[PDB]
Amino acid sequence: AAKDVKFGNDARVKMLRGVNVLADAVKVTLGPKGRNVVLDKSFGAPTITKDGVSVAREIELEDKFENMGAQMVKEVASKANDAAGDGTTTATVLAQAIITEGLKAVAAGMNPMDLKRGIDKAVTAAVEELKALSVPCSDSKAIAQVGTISANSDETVGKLIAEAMDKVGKEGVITVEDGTGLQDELDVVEGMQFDRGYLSPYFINKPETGAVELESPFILLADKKISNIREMLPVLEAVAKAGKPLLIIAEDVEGEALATLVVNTMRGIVKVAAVKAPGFGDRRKAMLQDIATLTGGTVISEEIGMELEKATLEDLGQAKRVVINKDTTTIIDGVGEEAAIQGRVAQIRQQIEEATSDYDREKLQERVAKLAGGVAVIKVGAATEVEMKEKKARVEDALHATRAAVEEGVVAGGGVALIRVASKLADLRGQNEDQNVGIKVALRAMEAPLRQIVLNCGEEPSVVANTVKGGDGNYGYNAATEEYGNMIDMGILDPTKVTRSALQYAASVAGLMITTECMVTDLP
Amino acid sequence: AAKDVKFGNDARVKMLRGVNVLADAVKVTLGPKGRNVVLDKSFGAPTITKDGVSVAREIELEDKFENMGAQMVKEVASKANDAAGDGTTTATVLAQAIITEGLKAVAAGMNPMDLKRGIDKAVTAAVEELKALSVPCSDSKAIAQVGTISANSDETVGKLIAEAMDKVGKEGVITVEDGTGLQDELDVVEGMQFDRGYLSPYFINKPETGAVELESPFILLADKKISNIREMLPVLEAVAKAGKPLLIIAEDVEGEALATLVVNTMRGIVKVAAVKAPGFGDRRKAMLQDIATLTGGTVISEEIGMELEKATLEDLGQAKRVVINKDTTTIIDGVGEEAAIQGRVAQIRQQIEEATSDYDREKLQERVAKLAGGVAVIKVGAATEVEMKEKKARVEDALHATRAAVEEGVVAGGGVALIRVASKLADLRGQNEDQNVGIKVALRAMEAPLRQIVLNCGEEPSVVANTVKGGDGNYGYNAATEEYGNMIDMGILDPTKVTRSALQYAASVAGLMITTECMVTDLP
Amino acid sequence: AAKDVKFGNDARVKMLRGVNVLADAVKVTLGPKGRNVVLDKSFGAPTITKDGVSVAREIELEDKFENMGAQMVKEVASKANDAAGDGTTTATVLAQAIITEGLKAVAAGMNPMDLKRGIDKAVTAAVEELKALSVPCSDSKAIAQVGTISANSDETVGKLIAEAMDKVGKEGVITVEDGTGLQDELDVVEGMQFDRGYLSPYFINKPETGAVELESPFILLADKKISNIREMLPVLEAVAKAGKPLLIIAEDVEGEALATLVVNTMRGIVKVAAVKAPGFGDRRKAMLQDIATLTGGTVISEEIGMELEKATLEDLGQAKRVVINKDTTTIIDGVGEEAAIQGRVAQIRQQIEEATSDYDREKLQERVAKLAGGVAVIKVGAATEVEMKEKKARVEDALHATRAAVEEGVVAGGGVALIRVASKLADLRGQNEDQNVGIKVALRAMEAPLRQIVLNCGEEPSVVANTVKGGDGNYGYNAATEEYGNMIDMGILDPTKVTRSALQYAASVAGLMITTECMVTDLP
Numbered sequence A, B, C: 001a002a003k004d005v006k007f008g009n010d011a012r013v014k015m016l017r018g019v020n021v022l023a024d025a026v027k028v029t030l031g032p033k034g035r036n037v038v039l040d041k042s043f044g045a046p047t048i049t050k051d052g053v054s055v056a057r058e059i060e061l062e063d064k065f066e067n068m069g070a071q072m073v074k075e076v077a078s079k080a081n082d083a084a085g086d087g088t089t090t091a092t093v094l095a096q097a098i099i100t101e102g103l104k105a106v107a108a109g110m111n112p113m114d115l116k117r118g119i120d121k122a123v124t125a126a127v128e129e130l131k132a133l134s135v136p137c138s139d140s141k142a143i144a145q146v147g148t149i150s151a152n153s154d155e156t157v158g159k160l161i162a163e164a165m166d167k168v169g170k171e172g173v174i175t176v177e178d179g180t181g182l183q184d185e186l187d188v189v190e191g192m193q194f195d196r197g198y199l200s201p202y203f204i205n206k207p208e209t210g211a212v213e214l215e216s217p218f219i220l221l222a223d224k225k226i227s228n229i230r231e232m233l234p235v236l237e238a239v240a241k242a243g244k245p246l247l248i249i250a251e252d253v254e255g256e257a258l259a260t261l262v263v264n265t266m267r268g269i270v271k272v273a274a275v276k277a278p279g280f281g282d283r284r285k286a287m288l289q290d291i292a293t294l295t296g297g298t299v300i301s302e303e304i305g306m307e308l309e310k311a312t313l314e315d316l317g318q319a320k321r322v323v324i325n326k327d328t329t330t331i332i333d334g335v336g337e338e339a340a341i342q343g344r345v346a347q348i349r350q351q352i353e354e355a356t357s358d359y360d361r362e363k364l365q366e367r368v369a370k371l372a373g374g375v376a377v378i379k380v381g382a383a384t385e386v387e388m389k390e391k392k393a394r395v396e397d398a399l400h401a402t403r404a405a406v407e408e409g410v411v412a413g414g415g416v417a418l419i420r421v422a423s424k425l426a427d428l429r430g431q432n433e434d435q436n437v438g439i440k441v442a443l444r445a446m447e448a449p450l451r452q453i454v455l456n457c458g459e460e461p462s463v464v465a466n467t468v469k470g471g472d473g474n475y476g477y478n479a480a481t482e483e484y485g486n487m488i489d490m491g492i493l494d495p496t497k498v499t500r501s502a503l504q505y506a507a508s509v510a511g512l513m514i515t516t517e518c519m520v521t522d523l524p
């Protein structure tokens, strides 16, 4: 359709106005004393949230040039959430500071591209300084402190996440889901579990719990559809001679074979339980192979050249206990030589490194947890649904931050680390005066998060900023207690990865937004 | 689409205006002297109701920020109705009081998060005090008093509900349905009944009542579809040799077998009645197994491995008397050893505890009632349809309240228990002054229900509040007769669960609404 | 529908206004100190771009006569992008200059058609002078300089492109795609690779990398669907006697033959791998023949009169190594007499010259690269997506300019070559005074690019134009460092083809736009 074209300063002031609208909505939620934003949903009740990316993803403006400004600055929060899972409000604050100072410098007659180059140079040096400034975060106390800070100063969340990470291991996974009570609870599963139950309730030998319990059984992994009992006769007779239970994990069992099995189980001839093979497609094949490796058996498949009639006891795995419920099957203490498990998890790590989508990566990580580590689930308790959503979002933030802090280390929080870095980079210069101005723009914008944190508390940002800049080390300001001290000693920790990611994404988007001259959009 | 964004006090005043609209509509119906609200329905005549959640679910406003406020406060009443079945007007009153005082405290420069923490601490202590303050409610007189109070001071409803609870027992169920006369009537069913009638009117041997009566029958429980009589000759021959009637509960009976049975019945050879198996799917299997357990028989099914031709007299259950009508079949005084019945009902209560949806839980409760207790039905009598609906809603409120009062106990009603609790918590303090202000906010808000009850009567709420606060024990105000006295002696009882749930949900939602700073919604 | 008709000067002023809107939007991005334009997209975030054709393709206006002017001048940028891949902003600037001067001359009472003839004569002479003025660009240093200049003064892009062209060769191809990191990387493939992997994971003999590696195998090129192994035995028996592996490239393999192959490979009988034939249809046939030519084998097809059962060792090709992954197949150091390779690539060049669409030509070039040269891929690294898109467009511009500079040579850049040409053509005259005025119009318009480049830097265009015109040789003005000097030694190079194309297309469209007298469009 027809277009509207704006040139120079008109375009820049419209763009800055849109940036300011979105940033002012987002920034009221930063720090221990930030507040909540109520978001109207077309289908349902409003959501009350303190998360930056959630607020940013809803903002759209009536004016089209201001809407372009807002849509451009939204990508910083989106990208920070995608990369680190936390630190989106800080990224937005930094982006707005850089855009404001850069537009001020441009209006004074500077070349925008040289300013952009200076900003890039300053941010590169800053990232190197941050990497030099970090310390490892390995003990459980520091992990508790990180989880507490990221969950808006909630000690119970930090303690629960530290316990979960200690119990599940370095190779395990932790998930968050809705609870049923009013208190948070942690349930950890050891061994392998897949969401497949028995195919016939008559298999139950322990009606007290409604569960099928087998001690030291055989596992027959059938990679095929079984409908006719004629195929299973040899293995069933062999196991009956053996005198110990059997478990069938197959693609499916039809009416005739299932009927024969249930008739035989209740007569006392054989103890047989049958469940479905988990997954659909290639992943189903992979997880059958994984169970074979864990249990020390061989998968019976037509695509390799073996028939189920010719199966012997050597193709059957073994375990110590098998417990089957209506929904989940667990295999406990299965026999398998370790080298096979380490080799399999090694291969899975290589296709982990060669994975693009996050869904595939998380499925592979869940497989590694099943084979080697554990799986923990945290249930969130709340009285209502809005409270449940808000608490669940906080818990997910804490979990992401603990992961990042483990994988890269921690720096002093509260905006102090960026101030220390900018103090260290005070003697950096570029090629021309515009580049030096851009370096100064970046270094000045590096103090915005602390100033906004102090504003949200109702204090004076510049007095606190001067007092913190006058100190050295981990000296900082505690906004929860309104006192100065050691950031590390009072437990205000930030992961290095979150700070670095926020700085990088903010600089990347703002440097481009500084260099605009014309804006082309549709008509009202 | 494009959005509208409001910051700070403007957002808070719009939100409070919406809260006030909804709360002022709901609160006029509180107490013995509350009034009715007329709700327009697009399809039909208007509904005249005195229930809080029914009024709350109807309100929607033109302005979008006020609509956000109303939509958020509606969840308190929704959740209270879902949890306790009663006490939603009290929850709405408490939520409005907390929101009003909290916004007043926020406008004075307090930190909303510390106020929220103080409110949480106060409510936790209050719930503990309420638990300490209750007394058991086990006799029939107290249950009658609770049912009377919850039905808007209607003696007959309380007496009827107490009689039903006495006749049916602890393990039975009671339902409410529309009547045909002008008087309430109670019909209680003893034994097991399912809604399946005879498959052929020719089976009727007693045309005076149009009913099929069999004495000491056999019950053949066939878990299969019978169409050819050839499968079934042996059991008919054996029963004919036995000389006493037979009952066939099967999936269905086709024309040929039904014709053979009906021909045989009218010649005096065998007394046979045929009915359909209740339910559809797995629940039908469970019901057939329940009848087998009650009657001491064996279900004939192909999936476990017996054929109906090989059935003997041991697979047939026994009873004392069977009466079949056009719609219902009843089995009275079945012959079966008790231990099977207790085992089955225990099993069922274990999968009751592991049930998520209320529909599944109430189906299992129906099954337990059929196996062990009884089923009662209360028909409501009224001249018109609007009166019928209003009375039926009152009766449902009364029945829910009696259940809650049995399961947790009673406290003194009229808003007196909350006043006693707030008097007890007068020395509670937090960590900083903001939290102390929040504690005071919660304690002040606990007096709102009594004040609104007195205001609905046309009296002075503050004079009555002062007089009641000056007393001790169960001293309170009777708003029906405008007299002070002992709450327990005059029979104004409230379940503990209703009070506790109202307090918890109101606090949970209001604490979050206090901490708002920005609102984002669509443009007009 | 109904039309609007405008005559003469009214039409011309509306047309010039539209031309000016489009040109003024496009021209802000010209030179080393041009800026970016933000383009709104209906689906997605805005795009920030510095490319002339991208900006031009977006402009549409409200007035229909101005819209006709804009839509007419848009074809210059479109055609320059189609022809050379670069120089669209320069073409637009030249077109606007010619149109403005020509309309001024027409308003003075000149014949438009003689002006058009004079403009054509001047442009023909200018193209001849440009061809005489060039020097070859063959060394890698000049290639790096061209790539650097065309990428907006980015040294790394030029160095990477020079390395890629050095490693791949004259007959190879280079492609640009999105990266994953923050740094640019170059990956070059030697030999032939096609993008189908193995047909069964059981073929993998090296689980460490998940790759199938075969040493000196045979290649059986079957242009047939293999489903029954009966057709296939003799060649497997022959190669089992031979004792060295085999590779099957076929249209596809069904379950039976694949099962036989996999069950044989794992038993140590024969080492067999099966992959799909690349392409769909005739191109599949052509690249199958190409693999036959490279590996020294014969394609087994029914359309020529041979059957796969009668195949012998002569029909099987040979190689040195074969590496198959999940996605790509790699054939390294295949045995084949060179004369066949040169014959095949020469033939492919003959149908290259006889190709119309660009898609067919680029597919042909890919096949030439696979048979003779190499294939390189450049991944672009950036922190966000807008930055990635902007950098990727810059890299593509650089790659196109480097190709053009290879194929035609370089001239002095910065607008200096056009000034030298126009200085040389100062004595050119036509047939009548109108044609002389047209020649002068073209010569004056030839100085517009330098003036706009100097204007975008904040300097005075006329002072710099006079100073550069007063010089000789490659003497020019460096707008990056604001210094005068020699273009060649400071490395500001432009391809001859880009300059010539811009001049030709701009003159072609502007000359026709000059001769307008009436405009007919729809009604508002």
Ligand SMILES: Nc1ncnc2c1ncn2[C@@H]1O[C@H](COP(=O)(O)OP(=O)(O)O)[C@@H](O)[C@H]1O
Pocket: A029, A030, A031, A032, A034, A052, A086, A087, A088, A089, A090, A091, A149, A150, A412, A413, A414, A415, A453, A477, A478, A479, A480, A481, A492, A493, A494
């Ligand atoms: N008690 C405290 N004193 C000072 N700074 C704090 C305190 N608690 C948290 N912070 C800082 O506030 C920031 C938390 O902001 P947050 O709302 O989590 O936004 P983001 O999405 O950027 O993480 C962190 O950078 C943290 O260092």
Ligand SMILES: Nc1ncnc2c1ncn2[C@@H]1O[C@H](COP(=O)(O)OP(=O)(O)O)[C@@H](O)[C@H]1O
Pocket: B029, B030, B031, B032, B034, B052, B086, B087, B088, B089, B090, B091, B149, B150, B412, B413, B414, B415, B453, B477, B478, B479, B480, B481, B492, B493, B494
């Ligand atoms: N005679 C009475 N005197 C004082 N209070 C009463 C009397 N009867 C009922 N109430 C109180 O009125 C409240 C009932 O209000 P109601 O309209 O049922 O609202 P809700 O939905 O909260 O139950 C109860 O808290 C009860 O204690």
Ligand SMILES: Nc1ncnc2c1ncn2[C@@H]1O[C@H](COP(=O)(O)OP(=O)(O)O)[C@@H](O)[C@H]1O
Pocket: C029, C030, C031, C032, C034, C052, C086, C087, C088, C089, C090, C091, C149, C150, C412, C413, C414, C415, C453, C477, C478, C479, C480, C481, C492, C493, C494
């Ligand atoms: N440092 C420089 N000094 C002077 N002229 C330059 C310099 N760098 C590039 N140029 C000139 O600027 C022009 C580049 O404009 P550009 O934005 O690439 O538009 P186009 O799409 O027409 O190539 C080229 O003609 C080049 O000769």
Ligand code: BEF
Pocket: B050, B051, B052, B053, B085, B086, B087, B088, B089, B090, B397
């Ligand atoms: F309004 Be409540 F349900 F008594």
Ligand code: BEF
Pocket: C050, C051, C052, C053, C085, C086, C087, C088, C089, C090, C397
């Ligand atoms: F804008 Be052109 F493609 F350099």
Ligand SMILES: [K+]
Pocket: A029, A030, A031, A034, A050, A051, A052, A089
């Ligand atoms: K936040």
Ligand SMILES: [K+]
Pocket: B029, B030, B031, B034, B050, B051, B052, B089
């Ligand atoms: K009410």
Ligand SMILES: [K+]
Pocket: C029, C030, C031, C034, C050, C051, C052, C089
């Ligand atoms: K350009």
Ligand SMILES: [Mg+2]
Pocket: A086, A087, A150, A397
């Ligand atoms: Mg955070």
Ligand SMILES: [Mg+2]
Pocket: B086, B087, B088, B150, B397
């Ligand atoms: Mg009630």
Ligand SMILES: [Mg+2]
Pocket: C086, C087, C150, C397
């Ligand atoms: Mg270019």
